[PDB]
Structure formats: C-alpha cells, structure tokens
Amino acid sequence: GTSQWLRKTVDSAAVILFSKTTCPYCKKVKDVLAEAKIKHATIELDQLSNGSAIQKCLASFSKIETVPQMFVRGKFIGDSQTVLKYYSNDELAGIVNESKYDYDLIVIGGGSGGLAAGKEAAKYGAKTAVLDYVEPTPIGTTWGLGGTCVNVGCIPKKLMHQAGLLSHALEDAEHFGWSLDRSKISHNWSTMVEGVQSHIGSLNWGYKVALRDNQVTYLNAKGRLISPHEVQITDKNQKVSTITGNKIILATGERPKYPEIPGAVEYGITSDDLFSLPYFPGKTLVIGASYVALECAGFLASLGGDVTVMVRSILLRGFDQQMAEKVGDYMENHGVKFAKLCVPDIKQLKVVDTENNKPGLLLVKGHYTDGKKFEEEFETVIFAVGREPQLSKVLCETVGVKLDKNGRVVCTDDEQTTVSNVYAIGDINAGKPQLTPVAIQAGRYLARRLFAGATELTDYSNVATTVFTPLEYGACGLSEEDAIEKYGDKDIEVYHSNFKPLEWTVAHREDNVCYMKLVCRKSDNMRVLGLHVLGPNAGEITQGYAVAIKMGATKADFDRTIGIHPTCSETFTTLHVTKKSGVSPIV
C-alpha cells in the first residue's frame, strides 16, 4: 500500500523534502533551500496518519530512518549534514539543476487548464515550460495568452451579456422614479468592444507576469509531441527546434466547426471573431442552437440587433428540455426570431466595408424539414454548430496516444493517457464536462500529484452550469428526463414553482415566467437528483446548492433550512407543489 505510493512520489518529484514540523534540523535545511532560492515540495510526516510507517519505508531508498531527507528527481541527496556540506562547498545548485531532460514539465496549451497546471507545478520546484500559440481564424483574427475563455469565451461573452442586461435597467429606472427616457438612448458597439478588449488585454499581460514570477518559461510557439519525451516547437519566424521534458500535459482545447456548404468559410464568422468585431453585426443570422448560439443571439437583440436563430431540431440538446423550451419562449417573446426545423444550404452580395466600418450583405438559402424553402438576406452570419479539437496538429500518431471516435484523448480517472508520462486536461479529455473551472481544478490537482506527493483526484460528477441567455438558466445534476429514464417514473417526485423577483414588481414585468424545480428520488430518502432555476442572477443562485448536492442533500434538508428574505433563491426552501398532484405552480 504505502510502498507503491512512496516509490512513485520520489520518482516523480523534482525536489522533495520529508520533514517534521517540530524538528529544528528540518528547519535548518528548510532555511538553506529558502536562502538558495531553491523551490521544493515538503511532506511533514508528523501530520499524517501512516506518517510513522512512511519514515520506516523511506529507509529503503536512503538507508536512514531519520528526518530530514532530501531527494532530487528520484535520487537521495542526503540528511541535514550532507545537504549542509554541499551548501558550504557551492555544490548544491549543481545537484538540484541536473536533470535528464530540459524540463520536468512541458505544457502544450496556454489556456485555462494549461496555465493552471503550469503555475502549480512550478511551486514545488518543477522546471516548467508553457507553450501557447493561437492559429488565426479564416478571416485572420488572432489574440493573446490565456486561452479560449479569457479571449473569446466566458469573459467577453458575459461582459456583452451585461451591456445587454443594462438595457432593461434603463427600462426599469423610469418606473422606480428616475427621469431618463429609454426611448431616446442608443448603443455604440465599437465603444463597448473597446472596453471588453482593454480588459482582455489586462488579462493577457497578467498571465505573462504570473508565469515570469513563478520562473516558468513562456514560449509563444506551436508545439508537436513527436515522441514520449520530445516536443518540436516552431516559433514566430518558423524556426523549428526540439525540447525534452519528463512529464507532458496536453491542454490545447478546441475551435469552432463550420458546416460543409458553399460560402460558409468565405463569408461567415464564429464566436472567435465576434468579440473583436470592428463594426456592429447589423441584421444577423445565427445558425445553431447550443448555449453559444442562444447566448450570442441574446445580447445582440438586447443591443438593438435584428436577430434570427436557425434551429435544426431542438434548443440545448442534452439539457433538461422543459427548461430549454422556457429559455426559448422567453427569447421569442422578447425580440429574438426563430426559424425552426431548418438548415442552411451562403451567397455574397456586398463585401465588408473595411474602411468605413460597415458590414457586408449576404444571401442565405436553405430549406425546412418538410420541404419548404428558406431565403433571406442578412448583414452578418454567425455559425455556432459545435467545437472540435484537431490533435493531428498536436500529436504524432506514432507516439501512441489513444483517441476516441470524436477525436478526443482517452484518459484514466487520473488524467493519464496511454503513454505513461503523458496526460491530457480540459476540453480535449474525452467524456469530461467542457467548462473552464473544471480545466483549472484538473490541472492544479494533477500538478500536486506529480510533484508534491498529493493523491486527491478531480471529482467530475454533478458539476453545475449556467446559460447566460437574456433570462439565465442555472443547473446542478440530472435533467428530469434523465432521472426518469434511469430510475422509473414512479420512483421520481418533482417539486416545482413559478416565482416573480421583487425587483420586477414595480417595473411591471411578467408574473409567471421565472421557474424552478427539484427532481428527487423517492426510494432514496427523497434525495435531490437535480436542481433547476430560470431567473435573474441564476449563477449566484445555483452555486451554493452545488455544495449541498455534492454532500447528498435531501428534500428534508432544503425544508429545514430557513430562507433569506427577500430573495429569489429563498423560493427553494419552501417548495411543496408536486408535478403528480396536478396543482398549478403559478404565483
């Protein structure tokens, strides 16, 4: 048991010190490393349960039973007296820095998971390189370090959500007594794009400063893993070279798909382009029905766009479909137009006016599911039909990393690939939820297991979401259909209720459009299987309940907790209408 663990820890760690909080001979050696500015992991043996057993099992490497013991890259360096002799004789710097490869860790991908892994590893003395490179979009769009969320995903889209929400705040302000007249106020797209971009620029810079102050090498280069320990890099002059690393982490993420139809790549755009577009999109057609499509369609309408969404079959495939539909009914009622059961077949009538900063004009041809024909003009056309990786760019097939039928890396539950020194994290890890906090947790936790002796794994179950559509949708756990299909209709009870935010009363907003429900399993103490809420601030509402769900909350737990008044969330502490009872859920 403990012998399997200590073997792999000592082999994997770069510099690791087995210590005791009390022993002043360990304090002496801690301070010497600190003075020499040598980073390392520590393992305080007095603070562990099998702590005493490890000390005796440590003698198998060192032939001593005592603390401290210093290892460097799988090799015993010495006790307190031996480490101090190396220090006095100016030999210690040479011992720690000498390695089989160039780096202990090479990270391919400077995104959410990738930067998180890098900094964490560097805290234990691992010598780390982070590679990042942004291949331009078909029209040339490029951005800086930090990944997809930072430059063209969560961060820019939510700020554009917020500009869109602020419009209803000016609508509301009159009813609450302010003297503005929302009718005579307009929106400037380029002004907003400049503020979003000025903030994205502060995060690019902050990531470079962070990497530098952890002594991480940052190479803006395209990386390719040609052998288990060899990464070939092509820099921005196309200078090719090769570096070696002990552990390898792949964190290269995904990029948007285009449909295989004429005009799409030539005349359309994706989210990658939307967030630094120099001109207002104008009359827009969004093709797709994922959360990217609905979210992007949502803020454009709220900034005064004439928006249409073309839907192949359903909205938010893979989400609870009752909720998905309520999200879409709200959009259709508040300015978004839907062309349902419809696909595209894209002609250019005007070129983008790059000097004057005006969109072009395009003609979209398609057909509906029955047979009827679609044809309409649009100034901008956005595709949101899913994302994919292209590991063939990243990974030579001769290395022997196994991929699945979607193009994603098959890992074990500790992120290990089929090559024992190669791991994958984030969106390219097959089967895992594709969310930025998941990538960050995975990368951080793997760094500790590789260099600090940690054994904790990332829990991928019951991770909560939020779709930032004009009315938001938070969730944690199973959809209603998924629970029913898994356990049987007669074993599921559902508690639901409409509600109305108190901030909507004076504003004369809708009475029975916000909604929530608890999906529960009767034969398991009425355990909460999923939580769902459509309303404002849905992410702040949902997040706290994810801890309780993680802990196995029951309906009785929600019941005996007392609500905070007046809030939207408190409606969860008093649910009581069931679906089976037939009673209406309206306020």
Add this chain to the structure above:
Amino acid sequence: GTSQWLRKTVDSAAVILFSKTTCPYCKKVKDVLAEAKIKHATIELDQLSNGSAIQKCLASFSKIETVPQMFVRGKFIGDSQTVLKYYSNDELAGIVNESKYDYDLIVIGGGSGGLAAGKEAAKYGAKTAVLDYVEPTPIGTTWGLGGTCVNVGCIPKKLMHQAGLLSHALEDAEHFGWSLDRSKISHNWSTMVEGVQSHIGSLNWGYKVALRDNQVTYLNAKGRLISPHEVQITDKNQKVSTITGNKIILATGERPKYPEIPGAVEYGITSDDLFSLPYFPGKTLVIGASYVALECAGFLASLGGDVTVMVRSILLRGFDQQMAEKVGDYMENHGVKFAKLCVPDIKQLKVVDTENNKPGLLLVKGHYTDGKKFEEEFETVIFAVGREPQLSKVLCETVGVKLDKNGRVVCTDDEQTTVSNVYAIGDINAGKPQLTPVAIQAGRYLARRLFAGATELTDYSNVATTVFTPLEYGACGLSEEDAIEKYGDKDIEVYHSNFKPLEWTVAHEDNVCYMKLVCRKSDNMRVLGLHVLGPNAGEITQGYAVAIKMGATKADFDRTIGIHPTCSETFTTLHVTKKSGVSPIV
C-alpha cells in the same frame, strides 16, 4: 411513549381521520367528508413506521382497533358505518361544529407569523380567527393587513434599495456603450413611493382574499387576552366584546423605539413613516447604527440625499465586526457622512409644508463622548435606535404568561408559553432570530403539530441573513470573534480573499469585495461561519445555508467546482489563511 403522542393529537385536533391508503372503507369516508366540505387532517397509518403500535393504542379511546376512525375535538365519532349513518340522516354537519369554544384557534396579530399559522390551521378543519390592528404612529401614519415586513419593512425598503442600485446601473451604462448622460438625470421621490405603495396595496388585498378562501375570520380589531381562553376585542367603532378559542397564538410583533429627549416624538420620524412619506426627506440625519439605520441611510444617499448617520458606539452590534467596518467604509466612500461616538440631546425651526409637499427644518444638538458639542441643521431626523414589544397591551398580567427582562415571551422549544394552551411566535418569542422567514416557519409548523399531529420542530440554529446596504452583506453562522471566543484562537482557522465582479471591470474598485470562511481545526475543519460582502449577497449566501445546515467542511467546499464567471464561485477556491499573514488582495 407512542401513547402520549396520540393522546395529545386526538385532544387538540379539530377533525381528524385515522386511515390507511389501502383501505376502501377509508376511501368511502374520505369521499363523504369533502362532499360536505368538511376540512380535516388525515393520518395514513401504513406510512408511519409504528402504525401497528398506534392502531392498538387508539382502542383506548375508541374501543375498536380498525380503520377508519374519525374524531372531532377529542371525542370519537364512529367507524365507517357510524359516520355514513350520520351522513344520510343530515346529522354529520352538526357533529363537526360541536365545540366548547367559538374558535378552535385565535391568532392575535396579522403579520408574517400570524397569517402563516392561520391559513395552515384552517387547512385541517380548525375554525380560525385572525386579529389585526395597526396603532397609528405619532403623526398618525397607518397601513393595512400583512404586518411589518409587507408594510414598513423588508418589502418597501428593498424596493427602495433597488431604486438606489439603478443609479449605479445608469453610471455603468456609458462605459458599456449606451448613449445616456448620468449627470442630466435626477430622481422623483413621489413617483417612486407611488409605485411602492401600489405593490403594498396589492399585498394587503391578496392577504384578505387568501383568508376568505381558507374560511378564516378576519376581524380588523385590537385583541387582548384576559384569561387563557378569553380574548377581548375592540373594533373600529370602539365596541367591545369577547370571543373564546381553544388554542391561542400571540403574534403581535414590535414597533420602533424613541430616545427620551425633547423634540424626538414631536419633530422626528421612524421607518414606520418613511415608506409612505409624501415629500422627499431632504438633508437627513439618521440616529442609530442598526441594519435599519444603515440600510435607510444607504438608499437615501443613492437617491441624491445629503445624509449623516450619528453612531453611538459601533456599527451593526452583534454581527461580525470586521465585516461591519467594511460595510461602513464603503458607505463613507460613496456619499454617506458619519458622526461617530455621538448621541442626540430636537428643536423645530420650520413646520412641515403640507401643501407644497416639502419637509420642515430642524436643529439637532448633541455631544461626543469626549464632551465636545454637536449642533447642525437637518430637514428630516429619522430615529432607528431599536424596536420593542408592548405586551401590557395584549396580555393581562393575571393570565399567567411569563415574560423575560425585555418583555418578550418565554417559550419552550415548541413555542409553548407558561399557560399550556397559549403559544407565541415571531419577534415576540424571546431569544429567537427576529426575521420574517423564521416567523413564517414557526407559524406553519405549530399549526401542523396542533391540528394534524405533526411532530417537527422549528430549527432556529444557523439562520442566514442579508443586510441590504449599498454593498450587501450576507452571513450564515458564527462571526469570527464569536467562533474564537467559544473554541479559542488556536482551534480556529480563517480562509479569506478579496474579489472583483466581472461586471465591475469595464465600469472601472479592485479590492473592496471580501469573503471569508471561519473554520474549526479539531472538527475536521467544519465551517462555523460564512461571510461575503458584495453584489447580490443574498442570492450568493442562500444556497450555502443548506450545506452549513448539513455540517459542511472546508473539504466539501474544495471538492465542489465553481460556476464561471460568478462572484459566488470564489468560495470554492479559498486558500489564503489569516495565520499565514499573506495578503488576500487580487
């Protein structure tokens, strides 16, 4: 053991059926009972783990062992066949209205807790009356059915907070691309009050309609308990009479205090007057430092008022004091002036202009704790120096209801007072968190124990709160100083971090929002307190109150993933300790 539960359930219930979901004789009786529109409790014996043992105990009352068994106010009515006989003979309607008293229940007090008990009790057949009367304030302000929260508390003051917040939403809009100019925009107090008052009116009406539809008697009169079962009522014409009830629930709430200084009652107002005021307060002095004081001073400043708060000693006594100071710093940095360590010793310079709709003018004199003198002019002086009950106005001293030193009712953990048919709920129940959702839960759960045999008690531990100051403050559990006092500094670890909402980056402060977790080293690092200052602090906090209730630890917070981008997600990655001395800024 089980026998003492049944004897107490059959004695208080008004109409109760003992049943089995399986039995078709039980179904037959059920069908008759609400064909006649007779409300009743039902106890399905095959869903209670000791339904066998209970059925045997029933015979001590009924001489029979089978189901269905129906009782009315403690007397056994009959089995299946006996009730059906009574039906076809037109006798059953008169059995169920047999009572020693006018009402199965009388609630004195028509607010958060009182309305909640009354509706729920009526659901199981209990003949119920709810009493509500609103004594005028010194200037004569009065309002309608629903209590303090609905009329002069949570509801109106949060609507006014929302009006304060929209001001910063207007400022933020320019930075996000909108064409307005915030400096050319002002606020209309009376437009706002009309909207708030319209909503409050629709709440008054909804509560009246709700009581009607549950067959509850609403008497707009002032009640006084003269004996355990006798309630003296005085109606709007000063007519006096007496009604009797079996059970009594006191739920009369509290009212604002005034300081005993000259001019306070004559020339000042309280929150009781603020939310229906015809004129904008104007330059305002706020006296006190409770959450009412700070909340009210907060939105007045955001609507363009010139606001000073006079603080006797500290802010928010009783809450975590690190958080109190941060709440006040933000207010001082965004408009609100503070006169600290200072009390008032009120002379009137202008009478309120009732025609043109304008405030008067006042002269406040006071002193700081060092002796130095205070003297300044204001248009409106608001007193927020606490609240209190006045039970010598509900409750003859001879009834035998014991009160504590502050005049609140001393109750067992099941809301029973010292007279065994009389109960107290809400703000007048000594020692209990004074909050509306606590009043509501206490009332509903007591109704179920009295008329439907339930046994669940109200759990008053770890109830979370939110202070709706211009930057909000949500909490659940122990403060940091309290945690340290109970367990000692060495057994307490505190994780904390600053943060900045994403909504704030484009609108241009970096390190004002703050959160911490107060944990216990020896109990697996249990979470003893959660604290967060920032926007939507109530939506943020609520969900965590469920996990705390279940006994959450630092490791439970760590294994849950965040939702990005949100403020709340910052709780799932805390790692800097106060011990470490490391800075919590970002």
